């Protein structure tokens, strides 16, 4: 079968695929919005570093709950 797709996991694959994209976009937007540098160069890096083992970092840290919930699901 295919890899990293519906046959491998997430038999529905109709809601989580866009959910992850929209939450990632929201996190990237709010990382720069709550800055007081590079959007895709730092926000995405922080997200991918928090999914696995200033105030912007603190507020992005809330997304670790979503990351662990997604991993458990």
């Amino acid at each position: 079968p295919s890899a990293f797709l519906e046959p491998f996991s997430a038999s529905v694959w109709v809601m989580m695929f866009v959910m992850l994209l929209i939450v990632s976009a929201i996190a990237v937007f709010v990382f720069e919005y709550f800055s007081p540098s590079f959007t895709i160069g730092k926000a995405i890096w922080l997200l991918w570093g928090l999914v696995f083992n200033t105030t912007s970092k603190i507020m992005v840290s809330v997304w670790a709950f979503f990351a662990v919930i997604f991993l458990a699901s």
Binding site: V12, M19, V62
Partner: peptide
């Protein structure tokens, strides 16, 4: 899909919104 996916999506969205709102009001205050 059905009730479970919608419920978990709403729960995580509400948690994220509450966290970002708390951070925003803390920064503003």
């Amino acid at each position: 899909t059905f009730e479970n996916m919608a419920g978990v999506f709403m729960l995580v969205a509400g948690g994220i919104v509450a966290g970002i709102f708390l951070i925003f009001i803390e920064i503003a205050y």
